[PDB]
Coordinates of C-alpha atoms in Angstrom, one line a residue:
Chain A
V5 CA -112.7 8.2 27.4
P6 CA -110.9 8.1 24.1
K7 CA -110.3 4.9 22.2
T8 CA -106.6 4.1 22.2
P9 CA -105.1 5.2 18.9
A10 CA -104.3 2.2 16.7
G11 CA -101.7 1.6 14.0
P12 CA -98.2 3.0 13.3
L13 CA -96.7 6.3 14.2
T14 CA -94.8 8.4 11.8
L15 CA -92.1 10.8 13.0
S16 CA -90.6 13.7 11.2
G17 CA -87.5 13.3 13.5
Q18 CA -86.2 12.0 16.8
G19 CA -83.0 12.3 18.8
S20 CA -81.3 13.1 22.0
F21 CA -79.1 15.8 23.5
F22 CA -78.0 17.3 26.8
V23 CA -78.6 20.7 28.2
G24 CA -76.2 22.5 30.6
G25 CA -73.6 21.0 32.9
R26 CA -70.6 22.3 34.8
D27 CA -67.1 21.0 34.8
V28 CA -65.7 19.8 38.2
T29 CA -62.0 19.0 38.9
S30 CA -61.9 16.0 41.2
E31 CA -59.2 14.1 43.1
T32 CA -61.3 11.0 43.8
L33 CA -62.8 9.8 40.5
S34 CA -61.5 6.3 40.9
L35 CA -60.2 3.7 43.4
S36 CA -58.2 1.8 40.7
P37 CA -55.5 2.4 38.1
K38 CA -57.9 1.6 35.2
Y39 CA -59.3 5.1 35.5
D40 CA -57.4 8.3 36.6
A41 CA -58.5 9.5 40.1
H42 CA -57.6 13.1 39.2
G43 CA -59.6 14.5 36.3
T44 CA -62.4 16.7 35.1
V45 CA -66.0 15.6 34.9
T46 CA -69.2 17.3 33.6
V47 CA -72.1 17.2 36.1
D48 CA -75.6 18.7 36.4
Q49 CA -76.4 18.4 32.7
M50 CA -79.9 17.2 31.7
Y51 CA -80.6 14.4 29.3
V52 CA -83.3 15.2 26.7
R53 CA -85.0 12.7 24.3
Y54 CA -87.2 14.3 21.6
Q55 CA -89.7 13.0 19.1
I56 CA -91.3 15.2 16.5
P57 CA -94.5 14.2 14.7
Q58 CA -95.2 15.2 11.1
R59 CA -96.6 18.8 10.9
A60 CA -96.0 19.3 14.6
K61 CA -98.0 21.8 16.6
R62 CA -96.2 25.1 17.2
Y63 CA -95.3 24.4 20.8
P64 CA -93.6 21.2 22.0
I65 CA -94.4 19.7 25.3
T66 CA -91.5 19.1 27.7
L67 CA -92.3 16.3 30.2
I68 CA -90.6 16.5 33.6
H69 CA -90.7 13.5 36.0
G70 CA -90.8 13.8 39.8
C71 CA -89.1 12.0 42.6
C72 CA -87.8 8.4 42.6
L73 CA -88.4 8.0 38.9
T74 CA -87.0 8.9 35.5
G75 CA -88.5 9.9 32.1
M76 CA -89.7 6.3 32.0
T77 CA -92.7 7.8 33.9
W78 CA -94.2 9.0 30.6
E79 CA -93.3 6.0 28.5
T80 CA -95.2 2.7 28.3
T81 CA -97.2 2.3 31.5
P82 CA -96.2 -0.4 34.0
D83 CA -99.0 -2.7 32.6
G84 CA -98.0 -2.2 29.0
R85 CA -100.3 0.5 27.7
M86 CA -99.6 3.6 25.7
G87 CA -98.2 6.4 27.9
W88 CA -98.5 10.1 27.6
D89 CA -95.3 10.6 25.5
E90 CA -96.6 8.4 22.7
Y91 CA -100.1 9.7 23.0
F92 CA -99.0 13.3 22.8
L93 CA -97.0 12.5 19.7
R94 CA -100.1 10.8 18.1
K95 CA -102.0 14.0 19.0
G96 CA -99.5 16.0 17.0
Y97 CA -97.3 17.5 19.7
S98 CA -93.5 17.2 19.7
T99 CA -92.3 15.8 23.0
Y100 CA -89.1 16.5 24.9
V101 CA -88.8 13.9 27.7
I102 CA -86.0 14.7 30.3
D103 CA -84.1 13.0 33.0
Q104 CA -83.6 15.5 35.8
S105 CA -80.1 16.6 36.6
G106 CA -78.6 13.9 38.8
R107 CA -81.1 11.3 37.8
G108 CA -81.3 8.6 35.1
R109 CA -79.1 9.3 32.2
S110 CA -78.0 12.7 33.7
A111 CA -74.7 12.4 35.5
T112 CA -74.2 12.6 39.2
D113 CA -70.7 13.3 40.8
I114 CA -69.5 10.3 42.8
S115 CA -66.4 12.0 44.1
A116 CA -67.6 12.4 47.7
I117 CA -68.5 8.7 48.0
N118 CA -65.0 7.7 46.8
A119 CA -63.4 10.3 49.1
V120 CA -65.0 8.6 52.1
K121 CA -64.0 5.1 50.8
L122 CA -60.4 6.3 50.5
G123 CA -60.4 7.6 54.1
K124 CA -59.9 11.2 53.0
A125 CA -63.3 12.5 54.1
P126 CA -65.8 11.6 56.8
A127 CA -69.0 9.6 56.5
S128 CA -71.0 12.7 57.3
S129 CA -69.9 14.2 54.0
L130 CA -71.6 11.4 51.9
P131 CA -74.4 12.7 49.7
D132 CA -77.9 12.9 51.0
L133 CA -79.7 10.1 49.1
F134 CA -83.0 8.3 49.4
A135 CA -85.1 5.7 47.7
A136 CA -88.9 5.2 48.2
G137 CA -89.6 1.6 49.2
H138 CA -92.7 -0.2 47.8
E139 CA -94.6 0.2 51.0
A140 CA -93.9 3.9 51.3
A141 CA -94.7 4.6 47.7
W142 CA -98.0 2.8 47.9
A143 CA -99.2 5.5 50.4
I144 CA -97.4 8.4 48.7
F145 CA -99.1 7.5 45.5
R146 CA -102.5 6.9 47.2
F147 CA -103.0 3.4 45.8
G148 CA -104.7 2.5 49.1
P149 CA -104.6 3.4 52.8
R150 CA -101.6 1.3 53.5
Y151 CA -99.6 -1.4 51.8
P152 CA -100.7 -3.8 50.4
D153 CA -104.4 -2.8 50.4
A154 CA -105.6 -1.0 47.4
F155 CA -108.6 1.3 47.1
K156 CA -111.4 -0.7 45.3
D157 CA -111.9 2.2 42.9
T158 CA -108.3 3.0 42.1
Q159 CA -107.4 3.7 38.5
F160 CA -103.8 2.6 39.0
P161 CA -103.1 -0.9 37.5
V162 CA -102.1 -2.3 40.9
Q163 CA -101.7 -5.8 39.3
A164 CA -98.6 -4.3 37.7
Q165 CA -97.1 -3.0 40.9
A166 CA -94.0 -5.1 40.3
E167 CA -93.4 -3.2 37.0
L168 CA -93.9 0.1 38.7
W169 CA -91.3 -0.9 41.3
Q170 CA -88.9 -1.7 38.5
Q171 CA -88.9 1.9 37.2
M172 CA -88.3 3.5 40.6
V173 CA -84.7 4.6 41.3
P174 CA -82.7 6.4 44.0
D175 CA -83.0 10.1 44.2
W176 CA -80.1 12.6 44.6
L177 CA -82.3 15.7 45.1
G178 CA -81.0 16.3 48.6
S179 CA -77.4 16.4 47.5
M180 CA -77.9 19.1 44.9
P181 CA -78.7 22.8 45.3
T182 CA -82.1 24.3 45.5
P183 CA -83.5 25.3 43.1
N184 CA -82.5 22.0 41.5
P185 CA -80.1 22.3 38.5
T186 CA -83.0 21.1 36.3
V187 CA -84.7 24.5 36.7
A188 CA -81.9 26.4 35.0
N189 CA -81.6 23.7 32.4
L190 CA -85.4 24.0 31.6
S191 CA -84.9 27.7 30.9
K192 CA -82.0 26.9 28.5
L193 CA -84.2 24.3 26.8
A194 CA -87.2 26.6 26.6
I195 CA -85.1 29.3 25.0
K196 CA -83.6 26.8 22.5
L197 CA -87.0 25.7 21.5
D198 CA -88.4 29.2 21.4
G199 CA -91.7 28.2 23.1
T200 CA -92.6 25.0 25.0
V201 CA -95.3 23.9 27.4
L202 CA -93.6 22.7 30.6
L203 CA -95.4 19.7 32.2
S204 CA -94.2 18.6 35.6
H205 CA -95.1 16.2 38.4
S206 CA -94.8 16.0 42.2
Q207 CA -91.2 16.8 43.2
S208 CA -90.7 18.7 39.9
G209 CA -94.1 20.3 40.2
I210 CA -92.5 23.6 41.3
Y211 CA -89.7 23.5 38.7
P212 CA -91.5 25.2 35.8
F213 CA -92.6 28.1 38.1
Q214 CA -89.0 28.6 39.3
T215 CA -87.8 28.5 35.7
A216 CA -90.3 31.1 34.7
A217 CA -89.3 33.4 37.7
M218 CA -85.7 33.1 36.7
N219 CA -86.4 33.8 33.0
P220 CA -89.9 33.7 31.4
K221 CA -88.4 33.4 27.8
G222 CA -89.8 30.5 25.8
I223 CA -92.3 29.3 28.5
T224 CA -95.6 29.1 26.7
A225 CA -97.7 27.5 29.4
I226 CA -97.3 25.4 32.5
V227 CA -99.0 22.2 33.5
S228 CA -98.2 20.8 36.9
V229 CA -99.6 17.3 38.0
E230 CA -100.0 17.0 41.7
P231 CA -97.1 19.3 42.6
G232 CA -95.3 18.9 45.9
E233 CA -95.4 22.7 46.2
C234 CA -97.1 25.4 44.2
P235 CA -95.8 28.9 44.2
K236 CA -96.8 31.2 47.0
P237 CA -99.5 33.8 46.4
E238 CA -96.7 36.4 46.5
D239 CA -95.0 34.8 43.5
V240 CA -97.7 35.5 41.0
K241 CA -96.7 38.8 39.4
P242 CA -93.9 37.3 37.2
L243 CA -96.3 34.5 36.1
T244 CA -99.4 36.5 34.9
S245 CA -98.6 36.1 31.2
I246 CA -98.1 32.3 31.4
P247 CA -101.3 30.2 31.5
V248 CA -101.2 27.6 34.3
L249 CA -103.0 24.3 34.8
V250 CA -102.6 22.3 38.0
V251 CA -104.2 18.9 38.1
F252 CA -105.2 16.8 41.1
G253 CA -106.6 13.3 41.3
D254 CA -108.7 11.4 43.9
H255 CA -108.5 10.1 47.4
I256 CA -106.8 13.3 48.4
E257 CA -108.6 14.1 51.6
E258 CA -107.6 11.1 53.6
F259 CA -103.8 11.7 53.2
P260 CA -102.2 14.4 55.3
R261 CA -99.3 14.5 52.8
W262 CA -101.7 15.6 50.0
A263 CA -104.7 17.5 51.4
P264 CA -102.7 20.6 52.3
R265 CA -101.0 20.6 48.9
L266 CA -104.3 20.8 47.1
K267 CA -105.4 23.7 49.3
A268 CA -102.2 25.6 48.8
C269 CA -102.4 25.1 45.1
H270 CA -105.9 26.7 45.1
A271 CA -104.5 29.7 47.0
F272 CA -101.9 30.1 44.2
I273 CA -104.3 29.7 41.4
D274 CA -106.8 32.1 42.9
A275 CA -104.0 34.7 43.6
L276 CA -102.9 34.3 40.0
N277 CA -106.3 34.9 38.6
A278 CA -106.8 37.9 40.9
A279 CA -103.6 39.4 39.6
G280 CA -104.7 39.2 36.0
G281 CA -103.2 35.8 35.1
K282 CA -104.9 32.7 33.9
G283 CA -104.9 29.7 36.2
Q284 CA -107.0 26.6 36.6
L285 CA -107.0 23.9 39.3
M286 CA -108.5 20.8 37.7
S287 CA -109.7 18.4 40.3
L288 CA -110.6 15.3 38.4
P289 CA -113.5 14.2 40.8
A290 CA -115.3 17.5 40.2
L291 CA -115.3 16.6 36.5
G292 CA -116.8 13.2 37.2
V293 CA -113.5 11.4 36.9
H294 CA -112.9 9.2 39.9
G295 CA -110.2 7.0 41.4
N296 CA -107.0 8.6 39.9
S297 CA -103.8 8.0 41.8
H298 CA -100.8 10.3 42.0
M299 CA -99.4 8.3 39.0
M300 CA -102.4 9.5 36.9
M301 CA -100.3 9.4 33.7
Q302 CA -100.0 5.6 34.2
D303 CA -103.6 5.1 35.4
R304 CA -106.1 3.0 33.5
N305 CA -107.9 6.2 32.3
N306 CA -104.7 7.9 31.5
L307 CA -105.8 8.9 28.0
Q308 CA -109.0 10.4 29.4
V309 CA -106.8 12.6 31.7
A310 CA -104.5 13.4 28.8
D311 CA -107.4 14.6 26.7
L312 CA -108.5 17.0 29.4
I313 CA -104.9 18.4 29.6
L314 CA -104.5 18.6 25.9
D315 CA -107.8 20.3 25.5
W316 CA -106.6 22.9 28.0
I317 CA -103.3 23.3 26.2
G318 CA -105.1 23.9 22.9
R319 CA -107.3 26.6 24.4
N320 CA -104.3 28.3 26.1
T321 CA -101.7 28.3 23.3
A322 CA -104.3 29.5 20.8
Chain B
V5 CA -69.9 5.3 2.9
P6 CA -73.7 5.3 2.5
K7 CA -75.8 8.4 2.1
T8 CA -77.7 9.4 5.3
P9 CA -81.2 8.2 4.9
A10 CA -83.7 11.1 4.6
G11 CA -87.3 11.7 5.4
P12 CA -89.6 10.5 8.1
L13 CA -89.5 7.2 10.0
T14 CA -92.5 5.0 10.6
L15 CA -92.8 2.9 13.7
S16 CA -95.1 -0.1 13.8
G17 CA -94.4 -0.4 17.6
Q18 CA -92.5 1.4 20.3
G19 CA -92.2 1.2 24.1
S20 CA -90.2 0.6 27.2
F21 CA -90.1 -2.1 29.9
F22 CA -87.8 -3.6 32.5
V23 CA -86.2 -7.0 32.7
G24 CA -85.4 -8.7 36.0
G25 CA -84.7 -7.2 39.3
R26 CA -84.5 -8.5 42.9
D27 CA -86.4 -7.3 45.9
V28 CA -84.3 -6.4 48.9
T29 CA -85.1 -5.3 52.4
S30 CA -83.3 -2.2 53.7
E31 CA -83.2 -0.2 56.9
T32 CA -81.3 2.7 55.4
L33 CA -83.6 4.0 52.5
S34 CA -83.7 7.5 53.9
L35 CA -82.1 9.7 56.5
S36 CA -85.2 12.0 56.5
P37 CA -88.8 11.8 57.8
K38 CA -90.4 12.3 54.4
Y39 CA -89.6 8.7 53.3
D40 CA -89.4 5.5 55.4
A41 CA -85.9 4.2 56.2
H42 CA -87.3 0.6 56.5
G43 CA -88.7 -0.8 53.3
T44 CA -88.4 -3.0 50.2
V45 CA -86.8 -1.8 46.9
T46 CA -86.2 -3.5 43.6
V47 CA -82.6 -3.4 42.3
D48 CA -80.6 -4.9 39.3
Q49 CA -83.5 -4.6 36.8
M50 CA -82.6 -3.5 33.3
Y51 CA -84.3 -0.7 31.4
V52 CA -85.2 -1.6 27.8
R53 CA -86.5 0.9 25.1
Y54 CA -87.6 -0.6 21.8
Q55 CA -88.6 0.6 18.4
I56 CA -90.2 -1.7 15.7
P57 CA -90.1 -0.7 12.1
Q58 CA -92.8 -1.8 9.6
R59 CA -92.1 -5.1 8.0
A60 CA -89.4 -5.8 10.6
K61 CA -86.7 -8.3 10.0
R62 CA -87.0 -11.6 11.9
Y63 CA -84.3 -10.9 14.4
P64 CA -84.2 -7.7 16.5
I65 CA -80.8 -6.1 17.5
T66 CA -80.2 -5.5 21.2
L67 CA -77.7 -2.7 21.7
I68 CA -75.6 -2.8 24.9
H69 CA -73.5 0.1 26.0
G70 CA -70.1 -0.1 27.8
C71 CA -68.5 1.8 30.7
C72 CA -69.2 5.3 31.8
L73 CA -72.1 5.7 29.4
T74 CA -75.8 4.8 29.0
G75 CA -78.0 3.7 26.0
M76 CA -77.5 7.3 24.9
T77 CA -74.3 5.8 23.3
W78 CA -76.4 4.6 20.4
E79 CA -78.8 7.6 20.0
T80 CA -77.9 11.0 18.3
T81 CA -74.2 11.4 18.1
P82 CA -72.5 14.1 20.2
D83 CA -72.4 16.4 17.1
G84 CA -76.0 15.9 16.1
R85 CA -76.0 13.1 13.5
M86 CA -78.0 9.9 13.1
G87 CA -77.1 7.2 15.6
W88 CA -77.2 3.5 15.1
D89 CA -80.5 3.1 16.9
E90 CA -82.2 5.2 14.3
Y91 CA -80.1 3.8 11.4
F92 CA -80.9 0.2 12.3
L93 CA -84.6 1.0 12.4
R94 CA -84.4 2.6 9.0
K95 CA -82.6 -0.5 7.7
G96 CA -85.6 -2.6 8.9
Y97 CA -84.4 -3.9 12.2
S98 CA -86.3 -3.8 15.4
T99 CA -84.0 -2.3 18.1
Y100 CA -83.9 -2.9 21.8
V101 CA -81.6 -0.3 23.6
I102 CA -80.8 -1.0 27.2
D103 CA -79.4 0.7 30.2
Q104 CA -77.2 -1.8 32.0
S105 CA -78.2 -2.9 35.5
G106 CA -77.1 -0.1 37.9
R107 CA -76.7 2.5 35.2
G108 CA -78.9 5.2 33.7
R109 CA -82.6 4.4 34.2
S110 CA -81.8 1.0 35.8
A111 CA -81.9 1.4 39.6
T112 CA -78.9 1.2 41.9
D113 CA -79.2 0.6 45.6
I114 CA -78.3 3.5 47.9
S115 CA -78.7 1.4 51.1
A116 CA -74.9 0.8 51.7
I117 CA -74.1 4.5 51.2
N118 CA -76.7 5.4 53.8
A119 CA -75.6 2.6 56.1
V120 CA -72.1 4.1 56.1
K121 CA -73.5 7.6 56.7
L122 CA -75.5 6.3 59.7
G123 CA -72.5 4.6 61.2
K124 CA -74.0 1.2 60.7
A125 CA -71.3 -0.1 58.3
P126 CA -67.6 0.6 57.8
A127 CA -66.5 2.8 54.9
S128 CA -65.3 -0.2 53.0
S129 CA -69.0 -1.1 52.6
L130 CA -69.3 1.8 50.2
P131 CA -69.8 0.6 46.6
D132 CA -66.8 0.6 44.3
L133 CA -67.6 3.5 41.9
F134 CA -65.7 5.3 39.1
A135 CA -66.1 8.1 36.6
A136 CA -63.9 8.7 33.6
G137 CA -62.7 12.2 33.4
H138 CA -62.3 14.1 30.1
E139 CA -58.6 13.6 30.1
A140 CA -58.8 9.9 30.9
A141 CA -61.6 9.3 28.4
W142 CA -59.6 11.0 25.5
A143 CA -56.9 8.3 25.9
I144 CA -59.3 5.4 26.5
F145 CA -61.2 6.3 23.4
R146 CA -58.0 6.8 21.4
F147 CA -58.9 10.3 20.1
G148 CA -55.2 11.4 20.2
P149 CA -52.0 11.0 22.1
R150 CA -53.0 13.1 25.1
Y151 CA -55.9 15.4 25.8
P152 CA -56.9 17.6 24.1
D153 CA -54.7 16.8 21.1
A154 CA -56.5 14.8 18.4
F155 CA -55.0 12.4 15.8
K156 CA -55.1 14.2 12.4
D157 CA -57.1 11.4 10.9
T158 CA -59.5 10.7 13.7
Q159 CA -63.0 9.9 12.7
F160 CA -64.4 11.1 16.0
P161 CA -66.1 14.5 15.9
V162 CA -63.7 16.0 18.4
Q163 CA -65.3 19.5 17.9
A164 CA -68.2 18.0 19.9
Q165 CA -66.0 16.8 22.8
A166 CA -68.0 18.9 25.3
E167 CA -71.2 17.2 24.2
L168 CA -69.6 13.7 24.5
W169 CA -68.6 14.6 28.1
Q170 CA -72.3 15.5 28.8
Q171 CA -73.3 11.9 28.1
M172 CA -70.7 10.3 30.4
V173 CA -71.8 9.1 33.8
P174 CA -70.5 7.4 37.0
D175 CA -70.2 3.6 36.7
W176 CA -71.3 1.2 39.4
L177 CA -69.9 -2.0 37.7
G178 CA -67.5 -2.8 40.5
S179 CA -70.1 -2.9 43.2
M180 CA -72.2 -5.6 41.4
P181 CA -71.1 -9.3 41.0
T182 CA -69.5 -10.9 38.0
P183 CA -71.0 -11.8 35.8
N184 CA -72.8 -8.5 36.0
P185 CA -76.6 -8.7 36.5
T186 CA -77.0 -7.4 33.0
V187 CA -75.9 -10.8 31.7
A188 CA -78.8 -12.8 33.2
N189 CA -81.2 -10.0 32.1
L190 CA -79.9 -10.3 28.5
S191 CA -80.8 -14.0 28.6
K192 CA -84.3 -13.2 29.8
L193 CA -84.7 -10.6 27.1
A194 CA -83.4 -13.0 24.4
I195 CA -85.8 -15.7 25.5
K196 CA -88.7 -13.2 25.6
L197 CA -87.9 -12.1 22.0
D198 CA -87.3 -15.6 20.8
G199 CA -84.1 -14.6 19.0
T200 CA -82.0 -11.4 19.0
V201 CA -78.6 -10.3 17.9
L202 CA -76.7 -9.0 20.9
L203 CA -74.4 -6.0 20.0
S204 CA -72.1 -4.9 22.8
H205 CA -69.3 -2.5 23.5
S206 CA -66.1 -2.4 25.6
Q207 CA -67.0 -3.1 29.3
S208 CA -70.1 -5.0 28.0
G209 CA -68.1 -6.7 25.2
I210 CA -67.9 -9.9 27.2
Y211 CA -71.5 -9.9 28.3
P212 CA -73.1 -11.6 25.3
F213 CA -70.6 -14.5 25.6
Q214 CA -71.4 -14.8 29.3
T215 CA -75.1 -14.8 28.5
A216 CA -74.7 -17.5 25.9
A217 CA -72.6 -19.7 28.3
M218 CA -75.5 -19.3 30.9
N219 CA -78.1 -20.2 28.3
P220 CA -77.8 -20.1 24.6
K221 CA -81.6 -19.9 24.0
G222 CA -82.6 -16.9 21.9
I223 CA -79.1 -15.7 21.0
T224 CA -79.0 -15.5 17.3
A225 CA -75.6 -13.9 16.8
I226 CA -73.1 -11.8 18.7
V227 CA -71.5 -8.5 17.6
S228 CA -68.9 -7.2 20.1
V229 CA -67.3 -3.7 19.4
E230 CA -63.9 -3.3 20.9
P231 CA -64.5 -5.7 23.8
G232 CA -62.5 -5.2 27.0
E233 CA -62.3 -9.0 27.3
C234 CA -63.1 -11.8 24.9
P235 CA -63.7 -15.4 26.2
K236 CA -60.6 -17.5 26.9
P237 CA -59.7 -19.9 24.0
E238 CA -60.5 -22.8 26.4
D239 CA -64.1 -21.6 26.8
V240 CA -65.2 -21.7 23.1
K241 CA -67.2 -25.0 23.1
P242 CA -70.5 -23.5 24.3
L243 CA -70.3 -20.8 21.5
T244 CA -69.8 -22.9 18.4
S245 CA -73.4 -22.5 17.1
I246 CA -73.6 -18.7 17.5
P247 CA -72.0 -16.6 14.8
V248 CA -69.6 -14.0 16.2
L249 CA -68.3 -10.7 14.9
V250 CA -65.7 -8.7 16.9
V251 CA -64.9 -5.2 15.5
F252 CA -61.8 -3.1 16.1
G253 CA -61.0 0.4 14.9
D254 CA -57.7 2.3 14.4
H255 CA -54.8 3.6 16.4
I256 CA -54.7 0.4 18.4
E257 CA -51.0 -0.4 18.5
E258 CA -49.9 2.8 20.2
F259 CA -52.2 2.3 23.3
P260 CA -51.1 -0.3 25.8
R261 CA -54.7 -0.6 27.1
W262 CA -55.9 -1.7 23.6
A263 CA -53.1 -3.6 21.8
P264 CA -53.3 -6.7 24.0
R265 CA -57.1 -6.7 23.8
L266 CA -57.0 -7.0 20.0
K267 CA -54.5 -9.8 20.3
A268 CA -56.5 -11.7 22.9
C269 CA -59.6 -11.4 20.8
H270 CA -57.8 -13.0 17.8
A271 CA -56.9 -15.9 20.1
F272 CA -60.6 -16.3 21.0
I273 CA -61.8 -16.1 17.4
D274 CA -59.2 -18.5 16.1
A275 CA -60.0 -21.0 18.8
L276 CA -63.7 -20.6 18.1
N277 CA -63.1 -21.4 14.4
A278 CA -60.8 -24.3 15.1
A279 CA -63.6 -25.8 17.3
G280 CA -66.1 -25.6 14.5
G281 CA -67.7 -22.2 15.3
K282 CA -67.9 -19.2 13.1
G283 CA -66.1 -16.1 14.2
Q284 CA -64.6 -13.1 12.5
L285 CA -62.4 -10.3 13.8
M286 CA -63.0 -7.3 11.6
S287 CA -60.2 -4.8 11.9
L288 CA -61.4 -1.6 10.1
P289 CA -57.9 -0.6 8.8
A290 CA -57.5 -4.0 7.1
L291 CA -60.7 -3.0 5.1
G292 CA -59.2 0.4 4.1
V293 CA -61.3 2.2 6.8
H294 CA -59.0 4.4 8.8
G295 CA -59.1 6.6 11.9
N296 CA -62.0 5.0 13.8
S297 CA -62.0 5.7 17.5
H298 CA -63.3 3.4 20.3
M299 CA -66.6 5.3 19.9
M300 CA -67.0 4.1 16.3
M301 CA -70.8 4.2 16.5
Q302 CA -70.5 8.0 17.0
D303 CA -67.6 8.6 14.5
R304 CA -68.1 10.6 11.3
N305 CA -68.2 7.4 9.2
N306 CA -70.5 5.6 11.7
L307 CA -72.9 4.6 8.9
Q308 CA -70.1 3.1 6.9
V309 CA -69.2 1.0 10.0
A310 CA -72.9 0.2 10.6
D311 CA -73.2 -1.1 7.0
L312 CA -70.3 -3.5 7.5
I313 CA -71.9 -4.9 10.6
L314 CA -75.4 -5.1 9.2
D315 CA -74.1 -6.8 6.0
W316 CA -72.4 -9.4 8.3
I317 CA -75.6 -9.8 10.4
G318 CA -77.6 -10.4 7.1
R319 CA -75.2 -13.1 6.0
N320 CA -75.1 -14.8 9.4
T321 CA -78.8 -14.8 10.3

């Protein structure tokens, strides 16, 4: 467990930009005369916020949030502590923190909603949208067996559950293609940067692997935190030159949502190693680190977890 | 026009948090078995990202975007130049950059959309939504007479129009009450900070004034860039102790959307001053600064404009 770094942070640079997007001509952009109903919008683009420390390490880390959340995932924790974005910067890595296509600062297309409101299209054509309620999220994140009872050993700062709920947002995943548009945008970003470590989480767990299969250029390594899906053993050949780290927390066994995902990720990692690649499945409890939730980047020992990941990145980007 | 500050930037502090929110009960959170349809969500909270320079000035600046955009408004310009967030930090001001309630990283509620999809609610229950197309935005922002023709003297980096379109997003304003939930959240933020300058734009132009009418505590000064509405002249009384700066750019008179707004804001400022307040309407062309678009924080002379505003803030704080 590292001491939290104190004092100021100096950055060589910072900024924001977007990757990708497609232009759509719509007839239903507006219900009022203040904004034209017929017009062209850009959709599917990906917001990127970058921060560059002094004398940055060769490969930036791109941080990719999962469901029901935005790039806030990686920023100050719900209880006010340093997050992984700031910690990584303090450790000398440039960071590229995205909002997935159709999430956060990355535009959606509202045309179908307005078409239904205007009586031009049926309710069945509304987009497939969802939001994770507090009670559902408690169990998905493995804070305890069922809301509102927490595991006594959880690392998540459950006293700050209200703040976690504040950062959760509706999810448009189901209304976009698969692979999600973020996947192609991550390839464009990796190529632009000429080498980045892709770090994903949960719903976006599979994204970096899909990006690498589409085009391996610029993908230095992949870190996936509790992915919803790992690649199939049959997907390893295109990945054998990209080191992979998959990280799982605690209280996995008692949740049917999660136990099979850990097992499947082992099948992937083992297949990857057998094919001549380099994969590791880091199960925190096996390292003597207990109680981590699905939101391990926000947990009370989040910097201990970050150090394990950064140590691995340093050994596999060498 | 100032030289663009060079070299690294040092942060004493940085972070993110949310203000506000309300918990609601839904029965339409999901149409799938992966997520429960019945549950509680938090909506109307406001995302806030802050950066604190060393030896920060006493009063932070809170930057509040307008329609069809997010806090990206204030970040790197579309053509890659320093934005006002970074420039203000380099000038010694702590900055708080928000996403309005129901925009960007600030959650919307999808329950009504899903209720309509499930047949539980009529289609009129759908939220009132809009997005500004490229063609519409060109005119709203006053880049030229019609898309994609630019005024010869525009300060906007029109070569980066595709990048500007990338930062534009759907707007849920019309589906929230008025005053928008952002207004009460700005009051909470101002009180938390114990004094901030509120700087708003266009759709949010009126917000700081609505905030101050709700509760003046913590509102040190107000800067409104090309507001869509200014307070009525009859409503100036509650604002007479808060210095106010309203800024307008160029090519106003040829756009019927904008000519009346400049006029109405003069009526407000004059009424405010007549009532004992302190208001200024800064028209850039009257200062010899020509060609600014509605997106003046992203224009090629954006640091010249920033310096005019910061000089005013310094004199009124």
